[PDB]
């Protein structure tokens, strides 16, 4: 279905973003690739900073310090900016420029 494909895509994007947060030219080319794949796809699911994707991500992740680090980074990115995908891609842009 379309919703299952969307959950698979957001799940794999979060898993690969977690793996990339733990080579900067290949990562910036990766984040440019996923952001162009976001425009062909584009809110209960993407509400603030990906709360509801937790069990989907840690079916395959199983290390909650990675999830807590991602949630803290997205929360401080939201606090610095002051839907959820754009906050992630601006957060992944700050990692890639370092």
């Amino acid at each position, epitope marked *: 279905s379309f*919703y299952a494909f969307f*959950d698979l895509w*957001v799940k794999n994007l979060l898993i690969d973003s977690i793996n990339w947060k733990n080579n900067c030219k290949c990562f910036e080319n990766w984040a440019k690739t996923k952001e162009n794949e976001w425009k062909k796809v584009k809110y*209960k*699911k993407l*509400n603030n900073h990906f*709360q*509801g*994707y*937790f*069990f*989907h991500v*840690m*079916k395959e992740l199983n290390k*909650e*310090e990675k*999830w*807590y680090k991602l*949630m803290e980074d997205l929360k401080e990115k939201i606090d610095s900016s002051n839907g959820a995908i754009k906050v992630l891609f601006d957060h992944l842009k700050d990692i890639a420029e370092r």
Partner: antibody
Amino acid sequence: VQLVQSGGALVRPGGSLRLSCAASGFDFSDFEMNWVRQAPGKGLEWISYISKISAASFYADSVEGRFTISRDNTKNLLWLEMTSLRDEDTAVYYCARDLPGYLERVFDLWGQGTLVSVS
Amino acid sequence: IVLTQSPATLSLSPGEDATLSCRASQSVGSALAWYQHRPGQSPRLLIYDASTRATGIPARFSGSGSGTEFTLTVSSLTSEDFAVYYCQEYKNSVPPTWTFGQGTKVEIKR
């Protein structure tokens, strides 16, 4: 394996209450925790969830903004800080343990029950 | 996902087999559990994948169902099997939901 709660308490509406759920016999850090609410003559109703660490915390739609689940995995205590209690929160509060596996979101072993009644 | 316990109150003699149901409004899968709220006691988990059996549960608690129709079959009803049985979906959708049923009830018929 045992989950011992704090016992019931009488609270005025609009007040606050801190439930407790002391676990024993297993590793508290390795298990996800839950809060399940049963009103008199209404049936079971999940209200809260917390993960192995505080990385994820989920609430029912009727309890968001009012209740807060917290855990202390070195003291083996699970709390539910209750705030702005209405008249529909007179219920029995159950402390449940989740099975290993984040997909299997079931309630394996339960607490003794805690009748919270508002007046 | 809306879960409907059609049997509700069930007048059945002890020592007999009792079948139940838990109809889901949406396609859930194998992500459904079953519970037993014995009177004067906490609930306990019986089945956690709509077919399996939890640890510490006798083999007479068996279930089936993988789509929208689910069924718990308890056999040889003892004194403690006359309880209220709940069914919970834990479907892997976003946001995650923990939805129970109304609670079917098994009672002694006379």
